[PDB]
Structures are given as structure tokens and as C-alpha cells.
Amino acid sequence: AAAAAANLNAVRETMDVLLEISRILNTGLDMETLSICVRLCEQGINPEALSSVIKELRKATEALK
Amino acid sequence: LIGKSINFLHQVCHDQTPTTKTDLENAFQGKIDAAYFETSKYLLDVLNKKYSLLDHMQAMRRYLLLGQGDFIRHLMDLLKPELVRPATTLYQHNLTGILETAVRATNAQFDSPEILRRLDVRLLEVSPGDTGWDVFSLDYHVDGPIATVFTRECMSHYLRVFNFLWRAKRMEYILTDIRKGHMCNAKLLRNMPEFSGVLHQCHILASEMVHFIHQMQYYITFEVLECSWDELWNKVQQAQDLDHIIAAHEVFLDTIISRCLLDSDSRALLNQLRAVFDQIIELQNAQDAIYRAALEELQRRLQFEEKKKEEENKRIGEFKESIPKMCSQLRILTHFYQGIVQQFLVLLTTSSDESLRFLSFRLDFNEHYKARE
Amino acid sequence: AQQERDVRELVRGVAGLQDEADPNFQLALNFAWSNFRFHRFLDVNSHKIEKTIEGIYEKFVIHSDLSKAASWKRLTEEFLNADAHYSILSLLLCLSDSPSNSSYVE
């Protein structure tokens, strides 16, 4: 509809404010990977799990060095 | 004001003395000012002795504002290996013992034990900077009724000024490591007139930095810690209200915030200052990278004769590869430094009209700049 | 369903493995899912996350970074108005928290 797209615009705003919070603490995530990590937390999953996983997968690409 | 003061004196300090004493043809302005004088005199008496307002003020300049300096240098000496590692593997039980050791070794031991107890360590969240050296603080904790003059916003100011006076108090000791390195290493190069060019050029680059970090550490003391101290000391020793003592303390700390480089407006100045601290910590590694190649050769050259009691020909060849690249690095480092500090000095003249400008007048009394500017 | 595609895209993005027919892709994926299913953490404490946010603000004001302090407060106060909040915050916090002397560009 129109108000059914206004909610997703107001979610796009929250993704942008999270896009600023992600860069000022100097994380590695950018907008496209960040959308993945928020869609996972929509289902319900530990942040303490996902954080250790991305802390490993970023080191799992300099092990094909 | 009187009804407020006699209620503070009851509800917090719990110290008291029984029995205090058409218009009314001027009976207000006799009763009110008589009572005001009496209330304020006893209040100031007991606050400066039963909870020692003055002791806290004396230990907030010596320690937080670095008006001591034996205590601080012994602490920095013992806390160097703690600071060099990232603070995720640093915990508070390692801080408090090193603080204790410093206190016993340094001048602090002769002071009163209460204020030494009220000084204690803290940590910042996870590891500010990851270099390790930004992560530490000293906080003086207050738990008496005199918390009302050491208000919750002014502790933040104390920690800001301490933060700046921590970084600069490290960098000055890093440059005297540069000078200490010159004074020892150049006495081995009294037998090698090949490194003497680059070794000399380094000696001069060092002295150009040494002076400006000896003008900061004097301009902070005889204008920001000696006008400000006299101003506060007068505005306490005269004052006939606690409400005047508070509002003198607040602005004295605010003036230290403006004259030091801690405003949001002086961020442009602070950037230049961080970039000249950059060069100081850079110069250490660049300096040792010489001696870890140059000086190492000579001991091996002596051991070459020790075995005899073509290889060393390759080391003579290595001299002609080492020395020019060392000089060419030192040249661009020197010129980049002179340009960046000159760019600071021209900006320094206008952000404030007299105070910040004065450093630029103190620093050059040769007019090396304007013939380089 | 979308969760599985997300975990695939997370492997592709973070680990830099854009070919699902690489065995290293399937190994990293099996690792990611086995990590997710090994329940070993307490659930997120919103109060501890709030205390950590305010201490970050305190660290910004202690270092006279006023624009970063004001932006930190404004962004976190805005975001915390319409559980998963404190999740994403703790996530990013553990993840790097490599905010140095600068790291700002706000």
C-alpha cells in the first residue's frame, strides 16, 4: 500500500542510523552485510554468537593467504 | 540564603550550635545581615576542618592538575610496562599495587594518608586507542559533604585536562629518550666518520622539537597554573558564602579548559598538536632503525678480527647502501616537520587574541620564521 | 528460509567466498551454523548494554571529543526508540570496538 511502504522507509531510516553507529566504533561491517546481520537478529539469535562468528570469518580470509 | 545555609549545616554536616540570633523601621536589614554573618562564619569554619575543603583543593591541583611532579614521574616510571600492552589484558588489581609502590617510593608518602586513599585508579572502556597508552586515569574520589563544591560536572573537566597533561607528559619523556639515545650512541661513532652526516642531521632535528615541548610545559605552568591558582586562592580566602566559593571554582576550571587545547573550537589546533606528537613517537622507531643496522656492524667487524687471531668487504659495500637512504629519509622527515609546525604557528595567532597567541611569541626569539614563512 | 540465505550471504561477504561451489564456502557455513547452534552464552542483559553505552559517552566527554559525544548520545537515544536493539549494540561492541583517538568521520 502506502502506509505499508512507510514502515519499510522508517526501517530504512533505522538502518542508516545503525550505519553511522557501525562506522564510528570502527567495525568492519558495511551496509550490505549489516542488512544480513539485522535480518538474523529479527529471528532471534545471540549477538554474542554472531559477533564471535564474524570475528572468525574476517580472520578466515587471511588464512587463504 | 541564611535559611538555606543553616539547613545545609543541619541536614548534611549535622554540626550545630544552639540558639542563633510602614516597615519595621529597618529591622530586616539589621537582623538579616547579622544572622548571615554568624551562620556563614561557623559554616566555613567546620567545613574547612571537619571535612577539609582546603585539603581537597590542595590535592586537586598537585595531583589532578599536576602541581606535584615527583609522584607523577615515579608513577609513569613504574606504569610503563603496564601501559605498553593493550588494556584488555590489564586489570585493576595490577594498577592499585603499582600505585601503592609509587606512593611509598616517591614524595607522596610524607603527605596525609586520607587524601592518598582518596586518590585511586580507574579504567576506561575497552582499550582507548589500542596503543595502550591512552588507557589509564587517576580519579580523586570525594565522599564527604564537600561534594557540593566538587560538583559532578567539574570532575569531567579535571579528567579532560588530566588527559591532555598525560599525553604531553609522556611525549616529553619520549623526546628525552631521543636525546638520551644521541648522548650514548654518538660516542661509538667517534671511530666512524661515515655516519657523521646523518647522525648529525638527526641531532639538530631533535633540538628543534625539544624546545617547543619545553615551551608548552612552561606556558601551561606560569599562566594556566599560577594565575589560576592565585585567583582561586584569593576567591576562597576572602569569601563569605559557600555559594561564592562554588562559583569561583567552576569558572577557574573553565578557564583552564579554554587556555589548554580542549575546546571543540580548538579542534583545528589540536589536530596540529596531535600531528607533532605523531612525529615524536615516529622519530623513536626511525632513530633505532639506524642503530639496529649501523652499530651492529661494528661489533661484528671486531669479531672478524677475533676469529683471525671478502665478507667485511661486502659490509664496506653495505655502508654505501645504508647511509644515503638513511639521510634521505631524515631529510623529508625534517622538512615535513618544519612545514607542519609552521602551519600550526600561523593558525595560532587568531583563535583567541592574547593568550594562545603568546606561545608563538615565546617560542621564536630569533625570527627563524618569516624568513621561513 | 530467509535466515539460511542470510547466513550464506554473511559467509560470502565477511569471508570473501563468493563461489558456493568452493568447499571452503561449505566449510565456513557449517562452522557458522554449528557456532549458532552451540548455545553457550547468557541472554543479552539490556541494563548492562545501557551501562556500556553511557560509559562510551563518558569516555567521549572525558577526552573532550564533544562532536563525537553529542553524536554518540543522539544516535543511541534515537535508535533505542522503536531488545534486538541491545543485541545489535552488543554485537558491534564485541565485534571490533576499535574506536581509537580518531575513528570518527561522523
XYZ file of C-alpha atoms in Angstrom:
544
model
C 0.000 0.000 0.000
C 1.269 3.434 1.037
C 1.420 3.026 4.823
C 2.817 -0.479 4.235
C 5.769 1.116 2.415
C 6.081 3.893 5.011
C 7.053 1.280 7.617
C 9.866 -0.002 5.410
C 11.014 3.582 4.826
C 11.085 4.020 8.620
C 13.132 0.793 8.777
C 15.496 2.233 6.138
C 15.993 5.219 8.463
C 16.932 2.870 11.318
C 19.370 1.078 9.025
C 21.030 4.421 8.274
C 21.363 5.379 11.965
C 22.829 1.910 12.558
C 25.117 2.546 9.575
C 26.538 5.521 11.440
C 26.849 3.596 14.725
C 28.672 0.794 12.864
C 31.361 3.100 11.497
C 32.059 5.379 14.462
C 33.185 2.417 16.594
C 35.231 1.283 13.556
C 33.664 -2.098 12.910
C 34.316 -3.950 9.674
C 30.678 -4.247 8.605
C 29.232 -2.234 5.735
C 25.599 -1.686 4.717
C 25.029 -4.914 2.763
C 26.499 -7.258 5.395
C 24.759 -5.194 8.083
C 21.366 -5.919 6.498
C 22.186 -9.635 6.820
C 23.124 -9.283 10.493
C 19.917 -7.385 11.303
C 17.738 -9.934 9.476
C 19.340 -12.670 11.589
C 18.596 -10.778 14.818
C 14.997 -10.383 13.647
C 14.571 -14.161 14.023
C 16.124 -14.175 17.475
C 19.746 -15.224 17.887
C 22.505 -14.315 20.335
C 24.566 -11.232 19.488
C 27.357 -12.927 21.430
C 27.197 -15.774 18.903
C 27.116 -13.719 15.676
C 29.905 -11.468 16.952
C 32.344 -14.328 17.519
C 31.417 -15.729 14.099
C 32.216 -12.501 12.247
C 35.341 -12.218 14.434
C 36.380 -15.588 12.966
C 35.238 -15.197 9.332
C 37.218 -11.969 8.948
C 40.309 -13.951 10.001
C 39.228 -16.876 7.786
C 40.061 -14.900 4.628
C 43.691 -14.169 5.573
C 44.150 -17.904 6.084
C 43.903 -18.419 2.319
C 46.899 -16.052 2.132
C 20.238 32.289 51.747
C 20.538 32.149 55.538
C 17.647 29.712 55.911
C 19.258 27.539 53.242
C 22.711 27.601 54.859
C 21.516 26.735 58.366
C 19.608 23.814 56.820
C 22.646 22.520 54.921
C 24.575 22.798 58.196
C 21.928 20.621 59.875
C 20.782 18.088 57.308
C 24.203 17.149 55.942
C 27.029 18.049 58.299
C 24.908 17.591 61.461
C 27.041 20.175 63.211
C 25.271 22.937 65.079
C 25.387 25.401 67.942
C 22.178 26.063 69.951
C 20.420 29.494 69.856
C 21.210 31.591 66.765
C 20.134 35.236 66.595
C 5.197 51.227 57.146
C 8.217 48.941 57.586
C 9.662 47.597 60.824
C 11.681 50.859 60.678
C 14.710 48.956 59.327
C 14.618 45.764 61.382
C 15.006 43.448 58.386
C 18.374 44.853 57.337
C 19.765 44.544 60.871
C 18.513 41.073 61.717
C 19.178 39.532 58.282
C 22.778 40.689 57.809
C 23.738 39.949 61.450
C 22.431 36.377 61.115
C 24.073 35.937 57.690
C 27.492 36.865 59.066
C 27.172 34.462 62.019
C 25.855 31.458 60.010
C 28.461 31.767 57.260
C 31.409 32.135 59.687
C 30.638 28.916 61.572
C 29.772 27.031 58.389
C 33.098 27.843 56.704
C 34.994 27.013 59.925
C 33.630 23.500 60.234
C 33.708 22.671 56.511
C 37.410 23.502 56.343
C 38.332 21.386 59.376
C 35.846 18.568 59.909
C 35.722 17.698 56.208
C 38.746 19.740 54.974
C 37.606 21.711 51.941
C 41.124 23.163 51.641
C 42.878 19.767 51.689
C 40.761 18.608 48.771
C 41.552 21.808 46.893
C 45.287 21.333 47.517
C 45.162 17.713 46.327
C 43.121 18.600 43.236
C 45.892 20.782 41.763
C 49.006 18.870 42.839
C 47.616 15.584 41.582
C 44.833 16.150 39.045
C 46.354 19.313 37.569
C 49.949 18.016 38.032
C 51.193 20.625 40.511
C 53.317 17.933 42.108
C 55.627 16.033 39.741
C 57.690 13.629 41.823
C 54.573 11.498 42.299
C 53.733 11.641 38.598
C 57.218 10.756 37.330
C 57.601 7.788 39.666
C 54.150 6.574 38.646
C 54.997 6.943 34.942
C 58.236 5.053 35.524
C 56.582 2.093 37.212
C 53.497 2.074 34.919
C 55.377 1.982 31.598
C 55.214 -1.851 31.081
C 51.585 -1.870 32.151
C 50.723 0.794 29.582
C 52.660 -0.626 26.607
C 50.340 -3.624 26.255
C 46.661 -3.378 25.166
C 44.365 -2.875 28.131
C 42.179 -5.923 27.504
C 44.884 -7.904 29.333
C 45.170 -5.197 32.018
C 43.107 -5.367 35.182
C 42.619 -3.033 38.135
C 44.344 -5.241 40.713
C 47.521 -4.733 38.705
C 47.009 -0.957 38.819
C 46.485 -0.446 42.537
C 49.695 -2.168 43.638
C 51.878 -0.193 41.232
C 50.193 2.962 42.513
C 50.987 1.853 46.071
C 54.651 1.167 45.221
C 54.975 4.611 43.655
C 53.415 6.245 46.742
C 55.907 4.537 49.051
C 58.870 5.335 46.815
C 58.008 8.910 45.855
C 57.381 12.128 47.835
C 53.678 11.160 48.314
C 54.488 9.073 51.423
C 55.046 12.172 53.555
C 51.564 13.503 52.766
C 48.392 12.843 54.715
C 47.066 9.280 54.265
C 43.432 10.326 53.780
C 43.997 12.243 50.548
C 46.220 9.401 49.333
C 43.355 6.999 49.970
C 41.011 9.372 48.143
C 43.277 9.231 45.079
C 42.793 5.920 43.280
C 42.996 4.420 39.788
C 40.337 3.796 37.132
C 39.838 2.223 33.712
C 38.192 3.421 30.533
C 36.047 1.191 28.316
C 37.641 -1.454 26.406
C 41.029 -0.098 25.237
C 41.069 3.537 24.021
C 43.397 3.824 21.035
C 44.670 0.162 21.145
C 48.152 1.651 21.618
C 47.661 1.034 25.346
C 48.946 4.421 26.440
C 45.646 6.293 26.358
C 44.088 3.745 28.723
C 44.603 4.905 32.325
C 43.224 7.542 34.662
C 43.545 8.866 38.165
C 40.331 9.950 39.848
C 40.167 11.658 43.216
C 37.008 10.359 44.867
C 35.051 12.568 47.251
C 32.602 11.100 49.749
C 32.048 13.979 52.179
C 29.563 16.859 52.376
C 32.040 18.932 50.350
C 30.889 17.025 47.243
C 28.630 20.062 46.659
C 31.618 22.245 45.697
C 33.396 19.479 43.757
C 30.353 19.072 41.558
C 29.718 16.238 39.160
C 30.382 18.300 36.029
C 33.768 19.637 37.190
C 35.270 16.190 37.719
C 34.732 15.705 33.982
C 36.750 18.883 33.349
C 39.534 17.618 35.636
C 39.696 14.378 33.700
C 39.885 16.226 30.353
C 42.771 18.446 31.458
C 44.500 15.424 33.024
C 44.117 13.556 29.732
C 45.935 16.274 27.783
C 48.531 16.591 30.568
C 49.054 12.821 30.423
C 49.746 12.645 26.687
C 52.140 15.603 26.720
C 53.834 14.325 29.895
C 54.525 11.094 28.032
C 55.749 12.736 24.822
C 58.232 14.952 26.661
C 59.743 11.841 28.170
C 59.820 10.174 24.737
C 61.866 13.056 23.341
C 64.262 12.945 26.196
C 64.683 9.299 25.259
C 65.685 10.666 21.839
C 68.257 12.936 23.498
C 69.478 10.137 25.799
C 69.915 7.955 22.717
C 72.021 10.596 20.962
C 74.254 11.111 24.004
C 75.100 7.409 24.227
C 75.174 6.228 20.616
C 77.260 9.051 19.149
C 80.172 8.045 21.395
C 80.535 4.793 19.438
C 80.573 6.673 16.119
C 83.704 8.569 17.198
C 85.588 5.960 15.167
C 83.343 6.010 12.071
C 83.362 9.283 10.125
C 80.878 7.864 7.621
C 77.606 8.079 9.563
C 78.544 11.526 10.921
C 76.409 13.390 8.355
C 73.073 11.681 9.005
C 73.900 11.290 12.723
C 74.463 14.978 12.935
C 71.337 15.948 10.951
C 69.341 13.893 13.465
C 70.904 15.795 16.429
C 69.572 19.046 15.037
C 66.118 17.771 14.159
C 65.847 16.619 17.786
C 66.708 20.029 19.282
C 64.111 21.727 17.099
C 61.412 19.531 18.647
C 62.859 19.702 22.182
C 62.314 23.445 22.559
C 58.630 23.518 21.573
C 57.774 20.761 24.061
C 59.707 22.833 26.569
C 57.597 25.894 25.794
C 54.318 24.024 26.230
C 55.414 22.688 29.626
C 56.229 26.242 30.768
C 53.291 28.116 29.218
C 50.977 25.683 30.991
C 52.559 26.443 34.361
C 53.150 30.194 34.772
C 49.867 31.295 33.178
C 47.420 28.365 33.485
C 48.594 27.094 36.878
C 49.865 30.222 38.595
C 47.433 32.998 37.636
C 44.627 30.475 38.071
C 45.953 29.244 41.442
C 46.350 32.786 42.828
C 42.871 33.696 41.550
C 41.233 30.691 43.227
C 43.230 31.092 46.465
C 42.072 34.685 46.839
C 38.475 33.843 45.925
C 38.350 31.246 48.684
C 40.301 33.015 51.464
C 38.075 36.108 51.392
C 34.667 34.724 50.564
C 31.748 34.926 52.985
C 29.500 32.306 51.376
C 29.748 28.742 50.133
C 27.756 29.907 47.092
C 30.648 32.226 46.196
C 33.278 29.508 46.704
C 31.419 27.205 44.269
C 31.017 29.804 41.532
C 34.683 30.745 41.788
C 35.818 27.124 41.481
C 33.622 26.455 38.416
C 34.992 29.315 36.344
C 38.613 28.691 37.402
C 38.346 25.196 35.909
C 36.541 26.566 32.804
C 39.425 28.972 32.178
C 41.886 26.089 32.285
C 39.660 24.373 29.666
C 39.905 27.369 27.354
C 43.646 28.061 27.676
C 44.537 24.423 27.200
C 43.677 22.912 23.825
C 40.461 21.141 24.819
C 37.629 23.114 23.227
C 35.560 21.834 20.343
C 36.543 25.069 18.588
C 40.285 24.438 19.036
C 39.990 21.057 17.291
C 41.932 22.513 14.351
C 44.754 23.494 16.714
C 44.528 20.125 18.460
C 44.986 18.328 15.130
C 48.297 20.099 14.509
C 49.326 19.286 18.071
C 48.477 15.620 17.596
C 50.454 15.635 14.378
C 53.560 16.956 16.168
C 53.084 14.262 18.816
C 52.915 11.836 15.865
C 56.429 12.835 14.796
C 57.815 12.365 18.307
C 56.673 8.759 18.590
C 57.692 8.241 14.928
C 61.226 9.545 15.492
C 61.940 6.866 18.107
C 61.490 3.969 15.678
C 63.282 5.829 12.894
C 66.161 6.547 15.286
C 66.572 2.980 16.490
C 66.350 1.642 12.924
C 69.737 3.297 12.386
C 71.481 1.720 15.365
C 69.920 -1.692 14.723
C 71.784 -1.637 11.394
C 74.730 0.752 11.814
C 76.081 -0.046 15.274
C 75.532 -3.800 14.842
C 78.069 -3.915 12.005
C 80.981 -2.663 14.109
C 80.826 -5.332 16.817
C 80.766 -7.991 14.097
C 83.750 -6.245 12.493
C 85.668 -6.630 15.750
C 84.657 -10.300 15.955
C 86.054 -10.721 12.427
C 89.498 -9.952 13.832
C 88.761 -12.133 16.860
C 88.378 -15.140 14.561
C 91.643 -14.337 12.746
C 93.669 -14.380 15.973
C 85.600 -10.661 1.404
C 82.684 -10.716 3.817
C 83.709 -7.452 5.519
C 84.271 -6.098 2.004
C 80.541 -6.632 1.468
C 79.934 -4.713 4.707
C 82.017 -1.817 3.352
C 79.744 -2.047 0.311
C 76.749 -2.076 2.661
C 77.810 1.316 4.066
C 77.275 2.946 0.656
C 73.796 1.410 0.533
C 72.794 2.260 4.092
C 73.938 5.872 4.656
C 72.233 7.729 1.704
C 68.804 6.156 2.239
C 69.020 6.994 5.952
C 69.876 10.625 5.131
C 67.125 10.880 2.504
C 64.566 9.599 4.984
C 65.779 12.043 7.653
C 65.640 14.966 5.210
C 61.988 14.550 4.210
C 61.039 13.853 7.835
C 62.750 17.094 8.925
C 61.219 19.230 6.163
C 57.729 17.794 6.677
C 58.055 18.571 10.410
C 59.145 22.185 9.867
C 56.267 22.754 7.448
C 53.626 21.293 9.747
C 54.725 23.208 12.863
C 54.906 26.420 10.818
C 51.362 25.753 9.583
C 50.339 25.440 13.237
C 52.056 28.689 14.223
C 50.311 30.842 11.629
C 46.915 29.429 12.660
C 47.699 30.020 16.338
C 47.595 33.832 16.078
C 43.803 34.081 15.765
C 41.516 31.809 17.650
C 41.865 33.986 20.737
C 43.542 37.324 20.835
C 46.259 37.289 23.506
C 46.552 34.042 25.445
C 47.005 31.387 22.753
C 48.969 33.840 20.612
C 51.531 34.280 23.367
C 53.108 30.836 22.846
C 54.105 31.861 19.321
C 55.852 34.958 20.670
C 57.664 32.978 23.360
C 58.818 30.200 21.058
C 60.679 32.214 18.436
C 63.043 34.969 19.537
C 65.278 34.606 16.560
C 62.673 35.163 13.821
C 63.692 31.876 12.177
C 60.140 32.100 10.816
C 59.082 34.988 8.479
C 62.379 34.098 6.850
C 60.916 30.611 6.590
C 57.294 31.827 6.484
C 14.234 -19.630 4.874
C 15.470 -16.054 4.622
C 17.704 -16.898 7.620
C 19.578 -19.535 5.595
C 20.114 -17.156 2.651
C 21.332 -14.555 5.152
C 23.909 -16.924 6.666
C 25.069 -17.745 3.109
C 25.428 -14.044 2.299
C 27.239 -13.439 5.597
C 29.810 -16.119 4.689
C 30.140 -14.608 1.183
C 30.561 -11.059 2.492
C 32.762 -11.456 5.560
C 34.875 -14.420 4.457
C 35.174 -13.242 0.838
C 33.989 -16.556 -0.661
C 31.601 -15.669 -3.491
C 31.523 -19.167 -5.060
C 29.214 -21.555 -3.197
C 30.771 -24.469 -5.124
C 34.031 -23.797 -3.275
C 34.444 -26.403 -0.492
C 35.757 -23.594 1.739
C 32.340 -21.913 1.440
C 30.551 -25.014 2.724
C 33.130 -25.496 5.485
C 32.759 -21.886 6.685
C 28.968 -22.244 6.508
C 28.935 -25.491 8.507
C 31.169 -23.718 11.019
C 28.811 -20.712 11.200
C 25.702 -22.825 11.767
C 27.392 -25.117 14.308
C 28.557 -21.977 16.113
C 24.991 -20.641 16.108
C 23.559 -23.883 17.475
C 26.149 -24.259 20.261
C 24.194 -22.335 22.886
C 26.832 -21.182 25.351
C 26.010 -17.546 26.206
C 23.652 -15.946 28.651
C 20.907 -13.908 27.005
C 21.600 -10.223 26.407
C 21.271 -8.065 29.516
C 19.702 -4.790 28.409
C 20.825 -2.979 31.573
C 24.481 -3.949 31.062
C 24.238 -2.775 27.436
C 22.793 0.545 28.628
C 25.624 0.977 31.161
C 28.173 0.264 28.414
C 26.550 2.849 26.101
C 26.653 5.547 28.784
C 30.281 4.770 29.654
C 31.207 5.155 25.974
C 29.534 8.572 26.168
C 31.547 9.320 29.333
C 34.771 8.322 27.582
C 33.938 10.706 24.740
C 33.311 13.603 27.123
C 36.470 12.800 29.162
C 38.588 13.153 26.039
C 36.937 16.495 25.031
C 35.571 14.970 21.794
C 32.364 16.977 22.015
C 31.075 16.327 18.496
C 31.619 12.591 18.941
C 29.989 12.644 22.387
C 26.966 14.570 21.115
C 26.632 12.335 18.055
C 27.016 9.182 20.186
C 24.262 10.284 22.559
C 21.970 11.472 19.741
C 22.326 8.307 17.639
C 21.928 5.879 20.551
C 18.963 7.799 22.001
C 17.277 7.874 18.590
C 17.921 4.182 17.892
C 16.608 2.959 21.255
C 13.051 4.144 20.407
C 11.328 1.633 18.068
C 15.663 -5.996 22.842
C 17.013 -6.503 19.342
C 18.458 -3.011 19.881
C 20.734 -4.112 22.749
C 21.523 -7.239 20.719
C 22.905 -5.310 17.683
C 24.721 -2.930 20.052
C 26.491 -5.738 21.979
C 27.169 -7.422 18.622
C 29.020 -4.399 17.222
C 30.727 -3.833 20.599
C 32.335 -7.272 20.825
C 32.886 -7.296 17.006
C 35.590 -4.646 16.881
C 35.163 -1.663 19.233
C 38.387 -0.429 17.650
C 37.433 3.242 18.089
C 40.819 4.909 18.576
C 41.809 8.535 19.129
C 40.138 9.445 15.868
C 37.918 6.772 14.163
C 35.220 9.413 13.885
C 34.132 10.885 10.496
C 30.602 11.353 11.855
